[PDB]
Design a protein around this ligand. Structure first.
Ligand SMILES: [Cl-]
Ligand SMILES: [Cl-]
Ligand SMILES: [Cl-]
Ligand SMILES: [Cl-]
Ligand code: NI
Ligand code: NI
Length: 129
């Protein structure tokens, strides 16, 4: 599913991401824009041989199982394909663990490089939330 901007903002808010670990909703929408372009089916191979999955490009090296990432963990206890679903529940649950791991949203390099410190509230402008 390709979410609209406000559509994703509403789903993330319903699933408890607004202000999760102190990160406002716009931070999460911004991350998803630059990770996946709001496309739940997005997959991208990483240079280390792991793959990123879904709306927030969650990495098979630590977080989900894809069966082809040696020496990798599955800390969200989920097949990586479950992070591609139209329903974002598994991605959100997993993202909550990631953002709690010590470095906050810096876990998403694209968030650090493209969202961090910017006017992230712009990402929820006009949304009826
Ligand atoms: Cl947009
Ligand atoms: Cl915001
Ligand atoms: Cl694996
Ligand atoms: Cl959803
Ligand atoms: Ni990535
Ligand atoms: Ni894995």
């Amino acid at each position: 599913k390709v979410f609209g901007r406000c559509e994703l903002a509403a789903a993330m808010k319903r699933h408890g991401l607004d202000n999760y670990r102190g990160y406002s909703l716009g931070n999460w929408v911004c991350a998803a824009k630059f990770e996946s372009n709001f496309n739940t089916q997005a997959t991208n191979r990483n240079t280390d041989g792991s793959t990123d999955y879904g709306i927030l490009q969650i990495n098979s090296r630590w977080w989900c199982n894809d069966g082809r990432t040696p020496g990798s963990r599955n800390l969200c206890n989920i097949p990586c394909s479950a992070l591609l679903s139209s329903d974002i529940t598994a991605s959100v649950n997993c993202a909550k663990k990631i953002v709690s791991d010590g470095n906050g949203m810096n876990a998403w390099v694209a968030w650090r490089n493209r969202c961090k410190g910017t006017d992230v509230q712009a990402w929820i402008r006009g949304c009826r939330l």
